[PDB]
């Protein structure tokens, strides 16, 4: 998996605590994770890794001039060909074509 | 404390601690192992 299971150290109890995480602590970090994921959902985040590019550096696609949510912030500079293609990918991901494997859809994906 | 330094159950036998030190840096300098390539103390 790409994304992170947890945010911060969720198993912190005393040694030999006979569980990965106590209720209290896991609840705190579920709060943290919740706020982050909610931020990702509402700001309509998008990332991409491209073939034949440094991979760990991910283009911020949700920040591109077309797909940008904000009407104010200057988005980002990504090459015209690569940008066109990224836009076409994001666009053609949205809907289910018959014969393809069903993949989970959301409001925030578009 | 899952996140924190491992502690010994009991102490270490000091004698044994001195026995493991035979080949350490100081004893090496005294053996004359490292080459003297520079001016050194005046």
């Amino acid at each position: 998996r790409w994304a992170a299971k947890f945010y911060g150290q969720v198993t912190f109890g005393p040694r030999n605590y006979p569980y990965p995480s106590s209720r209290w602590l896991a609840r705190r970090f579920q709060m943290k994770k919740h706020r982050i994921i909610k931020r990702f959902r509402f700001r309509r985040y998008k990332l991409a890794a491209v073939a034949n590019l440094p991979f760990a550096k991910m283009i911020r696609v949700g920040m591109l001039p077309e797909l940008k949510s904000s009407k104010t912030k200057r988005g980002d500079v990504v090459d015209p060909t690569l940008s066109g293609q990224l836009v076409s990918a994001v666009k053609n991901t949205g809907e289910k074509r018959k014969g393809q494997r069903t993949r989970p859809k959301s409001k925030y994906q578009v | 404390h899952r996140s924190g330094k491992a502690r010994a159950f009991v102490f270490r036998d000091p004698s044994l601690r001195m026995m493991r030190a035979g080949s350490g840096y100081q004893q090496l300098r005294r053996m004359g192992m490292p080459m003297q390539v520079g001016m050194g103390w005046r």
């Binding site: 005393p14 040694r15 030999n16 605590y17 970090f29 943290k32 | -």
Partner: peptide, 24 residues
């Protein structure tokens, strides 16, 4: 997180595995 204890909670129990984890 919130960096401070909101609750002042002191449990007094000292289970032997929590303390000597070298032997249990």
């Amino acid at each position: 997180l919130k960096t401070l204890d909101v609750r002042e909670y002191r449990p007094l129990a000292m289970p032997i595995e929590f303390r000597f984890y070298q032997r249990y």
